[PDB]
Design a protein around this ligand. Structure first.
Ligand SMILES: [Zn+2]
Ligand SMILES: [Zn+2]
Lengths: 6, 50
Protein backbone atom coordinates (compact mmCIF):
# COMPACT_ATOMS: atom_id res chain seq x y z
CA UNK A 1 0.00 0.00 0.00
CA UNK A 2 1.17 3.56 -0.70
CA UNK A 3 2.60 5.49 2.21
CA UNK A 4 4.04 8.86 2.90
CA UNK A 5 6.19 10.37 5.55
CA UNK A 6 5.64 13.95 6.49
CA UNK B 1 -4.87 23.31 5.59
CA UNK B 2 -6.30 19.97 4.42
CA UNK B 3 -7.41 17.40 6.96
CA UNK B 4 -7.35 13.61 6.61
CA UNK B 5 -8.03 10.29 8.23
CA UNK B 6 -10.87 9.12 10.48
CA UNK B 7 -9.67 11.75 13.00
CA UNK B 8 -10.05 14.72 10.67
CA UNK B 9 -6.63 16.15 11.49
CA UNK B 10 -3.83 17.58 9.36
CA UNK B 11 -1.04 15.39 8.00
CA UNK B 12 1.57 14.26 10.44
CA UNK B 13 3.90 11.34 10.87
CA UNK B 14 3.67 8.28 8.60
CA UNK B 15 0.42 7.92 6.71
CA UNK B 16 -1.10 5.18 4.53
CA UNK B 17 -3.39 5.44 1.51
CA UNK B 18 -6.51 3.33 1.10
CA UNK B 19 -6.30 1.00 -1.88
CA UNK B 20 -9.96 1.74 -2.80
CA UNK B 21 -9.52 4.34 -5.55
CA UNK B 22 -13.02 5.57 -4.64
CA UNK B 23 -12.15 6.24 -1.01
CA UNK B 24 -13.48 9.60 0.11
CA UNK B 25 -10.74 10.08 2.72
CA UNK B 26 -7.73 8.35 1.04
CA UNK B 27 -5.02 9.12 3.64
CA UNK B 28 -4.78 7.87 7.25
CA UNK B 29 -2.32 8.31 10.07
CA UNK B 30 -0.60 4.97 10.91
CA UNK B 31 -1.49 5.30 14.61
CA UNK B 32 -5.17 5.95 13.91
CA UNK B 33 -5.60 2.69 12.02
CA UNK B 34 -3.33 0.47 14.06
CA UNK B 35 -0.34 0.29 11.76
CA UNK B 36 3.29 0.08 12.70
CA UNK B 37 4.86 -0.33 9.26
CA UNK B 38 3.93 0.15 5.63
CA UNK B 39 1.61 -2.69 4.49
CA UNK B 40 3.42 -4.54 1.72
CA UNK B 41 0.24 -5.60 -0.05
CA UNK B 42 -3.31 -4.25 -0.12
CA UNK B 43 -4.62 -2.04 2.66
CA UNK B 44 -8.20 -0.75 3.02
CA UNK B 45 -9.36 1.80 5.53
CA UNK B 46 -11.94 1.13 8.25
CA UNK B 47 -14.62 2.89 6.25
CA UNK B 48 -14.04 0.93 3.04
CA UNK B 49 -13.54 -2.35 4.73
CA UNK B 50 -15.69 -2.27 7.84
ZN1 LIG C 1 -5.75 10.16 12.11
ZN1 LIG D 1 -10.95 3.80 2.20
Amino acid sequence: ARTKQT
Amino acid sequence: EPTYCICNQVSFGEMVACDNNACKIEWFHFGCVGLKEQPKGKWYCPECAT
